[PDB]
Symmetry: none
Subunit: 149 residues, 4 copies
């Protein structure tokens, strides 16, 4: 399967198997995990080693991900400001979780949607957010451009 | 091997190799060809069997295909009205030709983008991603949904 | 369906679906809703988040909309003077609600009836007030021109 | 967007780059151009497609733009009456051209300065600050509020 992807030094995009790799996460100084699924466990919750957030979304055509953008960015920024890394994952690292990372890059590194997509896809070539999510990323771009978030 | 792909009784999608299958073209009653590249030959041109239109695109970062939509739709319709089939092809991955097919299904059979995409990909499972064309289709969808002329 | 239409920075024209989209309304800083129907609910009334006004009109050939113009304008102006936006809707955003917006623009931005129509239609191409309403907009123009309101 | 900006059905605002987009101009039915610089070319002049007016300003300390308002309004109106669009452009930041657009909205659609500014910036989020033009618009607002001719 595809390896865990460093996006920034403190932000890693991955799949459910990555979220179980305790040794890798501790090597990378990860202290925060975002699980972008309704149904997966928070792996290693009971060892109390990470701070977790669930964004309980499906990968469907009606799922609203935009509603979770602000919360996710705040959590990435919490990890960032205290010098820890954050792992964000869904099942494959292809769609839900990639959409959140692209959006983070749009807001916080001011990349266009196209540039943030290519930035992530260059690092993790299997990403492919569904068209619903792609439409949300375009509306998010509009709203960022007009100062509307 | 493979061959060109039925989309509607009068509309077929294919790649570079598929366009060279003169036997399949005649059996499927294809009378019209759209070649969505600047550099490929008009296959079978010298035989004088078909009506051609070249849309001289590239599969590049800034290629505008929306500009050709109205012209391609008119030519599909002229074949439709004549009782002949039209093949639209580009190259391996069918990214440019699929973009125009999806557009035609969105405008003329009123499918949403996601539904037209799924309709085409169900028939033609390999569609190379192109973020630029995907964005032109999402904008074309917004325009159709808003009733823009 | 057509997307919600910003007419002015504090005035949005929409359909019944738009009036349910709580997240969009709060993003747009909407604090006021006008519902131009007799029979639809005031969506989200029970969350006590918006100020509402019902203009309980039908889309018929006998319906008097002029009688509601002054009330609607006062409400739009309440929203405007306190720095909030207003969403006005009927079922489709096509006829009743569009007529009210066109009339607001005639009185408060001094647009002719033709110019206010084209202004709204340019932003929301699906609008089409019925001929009864169009006749009322013309007599409203007369009364504005003569100072008779 | 990467092109000129609709303000009213017949009035568009843009920069140096936007003025060079001959396809966008024709598609939007722009027949008229106001170039608010002393030094830029009249783009597309040799094609004989458009009616031009140069307002030979600079974006400087003491540049008076108020002096051109009446002339620019007459030209906008001539286009409006003709059924054609008018593009007004200057350079990156659109400070001079936006000043004239805001002036026209204040005089002809009677928006307050702040509301006209917000209307334009909502459509065109980058407006370079110019304290001198802002002061001219504030004095023009006072004149209009006092009924000065």
């Amino acid at each position: 399967s595809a390896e865990l992807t460093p996006i920034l030094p403190f932000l890693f995009l991955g799949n459910e198997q990555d979220a179980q790799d305790l040794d890798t996460m501790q090597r990378l100084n990860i202290g925060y995990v975002i699980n972008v699924t309704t149904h997966l466990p928070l792996y290693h919750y009971e060892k109390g080693l990470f701070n977790y957030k669930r964004l309980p979304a499906t990968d469907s055509n009606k799922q609203n991900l935009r509603q979770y953008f602000e919360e996710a960015f705040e959590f990435i920024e919490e990890a960032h400001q205290c010098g820890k890394g954050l792992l964000i994952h869904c099942q494959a690292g292809v769609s839900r979780s990639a959409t959140i990372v692209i959006a983070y890059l749009m807001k916080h590194t001011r990349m266009t949607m196209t540039d943030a997509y290519k930035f992530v896809k260059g690092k993790r070539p299997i990403i492919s957010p569904n068209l619903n999510f792609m439409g949300q990323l375009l509306e998010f771009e509009e709203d960022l451009n007009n100062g509307v978030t």
